[PDB]
């Protein structure tokens with residue numbers, strides 16, 4: 001039913017073949033995968049064996065009969081098929097895809113059991129280790145990070161999102177373990193089962209000093225003991241409301257439980273949607289619940305990504321792009337529509353910045369990607385699949401008649417492809433097949449531009465209300481700073497209630513907008529907050545309750561950015577002290593850049609003080625940012 005513009009692009013088979021794997025995944029059905037692992041903090045490496053039950057698949061005549069797995073920097077100790085040594089070879093590593101594991105399968109049967117014993121290497125890319133000086137708890141920690149193609153560096157496997165397998169796991173570890181599955185009931189061997197098929201990239205493992213507490217009827221939180229009581233409180237009141245909000249929009253939650261792991265303070269990343277165990281950063285804990293809207297993202301993934309998966313990294317938008325959409329649908333259901341549109345607006349800025357900042361936008365800003373076997377999927381990561389993808393789905397919601405008319409397709413799509421993987425073409429077909437009465441409407445969508453052209457997509461029209469309220473107030477501050485003289489003059493034009501209704505994103509955007517000297521392009525030429533310390537100190541005093549006393553990390557960061565920009569020298573020490581309490585790249589790295597710009601000495605001293613309490617990658621970058 002599709003337009004020619006994209007029928008010409010259509011592959012011979014769908015799901016489109018995944019160039020980013022060296023494995024011959026098309027030739028097997030993975031009936032089940034068993035992981036038998038042992039963690040060694042001593043050696044900072046993971047050991048054991050993986051056991052696949054495979055069925056050979058057949059098609060056509062006179063075909064090859066092979067067995068190829070992916071590995072990256074992995075020590076493959078031995079290989080058994082149906083309880084017998086099978087000859088094997090690790091091919092010469094090539095970049096960026098790794099080392100093909102070729103196995104000579106001497107068996108007769110189309111069904112067999114494949115067992116591979118391995119150790120991770122000191123060059124393993126899948127695992128992140130931290131020492132006791134890098135956790136507040138005092139004890140060590142390890143967590144996995146598999147997306148996009150690092151699972152092959154954790155265990156030999158068919159490392160493509162086109163392949164999904166139920167899992168079982170037995171993990172042995174000195175400290176407690178959590179896994180991307182549901183724990184079964186040695187005092188320190190930990191067993192799990194994932195009864196819903198998953199792709200390797202969604203496998204999650206973590207181990208360290210971990211406690212657990214209920215945050216709802218089907219939700220438990222895991223974190224360091226000291227933090228447990230604060231994490232319990234943060235999520236208690238909203239996690240279930242969130243899950244039900246999502247089921248009501250899409251359909252029933254499938255995985256049984258939704259659990260959250262609040263990683264150690266040195267955890268440098270943002271979050272990860274591992275099935276049954278969502279990885280989260282401690283910077284959600286705001287002590288006022290101002291940062292939980294975020295939990296919507298990884299929750300949505302339960303459907304977009306985990307349940308219905310992109311078949312390859314050319315089609316990642318099907319994953320993240322849908323997630324942003326559903327994410328925003330959930331926060332819309334809870335906070336209203338203007339709030340959904342606010343997120344959208346912001347996403348649009350982020351998108352424009354992303355594309356303006358790329359090396360090679362011509363290639364990496366197209367929605368559907370084209371990696372072949374020689375591009376590192378990580379190089380194609382941008383805001384594009386998130387926002388350009390979201391915007392297509394929003395454009396579709398709009399031109400098909402809104403949520404009442406779109407929702408039915410949402411449920412059809414996720415039900416159709418449940419526990420399966422697809423490309424962009426199967427997504428369009430499904431679209432067309434479901435709206436035979438709207439063929440007129442779909443045909444008028446510029447598919448070439450949306451899926452395949454670089455740069456910004458057709459600009460949408462969002463409810464700009466929440467933004468305008470921020471811009472108005474920041475402009476008025478900038479304008480007033482120029483002519484008012486006294487702290488009591490500022491208490492006469494402003495008051496704590498100016499911002500009483502500002503959500504987190506609004507405060508963050510308010511501080512960001514101030515540092516940009518307002519929103520009107522009719523900005524003052526020579527304006528510099530540093531030149532108006534009466535003004536700036538009054539802004540912080542008057543808005544002390546929601547800004548200065550906020551323990552939300554996103555607002556704390558911006559408050560600091562405004563303080564350094566207003567050159568309030570007495571605050572530099574507080575920014576410096578704070579950088580020793582957070583581990584996220586997002587804050588730590590820019591944190592030192594700010595600091596360095598106003599007090600290089602305090603910066604260098606601060607780094608020296610804290611450098612060894614950070615995730616190694618955060619230490620290395622910051623160290624070199626500071627010309628060390």
Ligand SMILES: N[C@H](CCC(=O)N[C@@H](CS)C(=O)NCC(=O)O)C(=O)O
Nearest residue numbers: 056057058064065106107108109110
């Ligand atoms: N065509 C192979 C079957 C493998 C095969 O060579 N089968 C052998 C067993 S060693 C055989 O004896 N087939 C002939 C027969 O059973 O008469 C597949 O399904 O992947």
Ligand SMILES: [Zn+2]
Nearest residue numbers: 297301320323
């Ligand atoms: Zn995501």
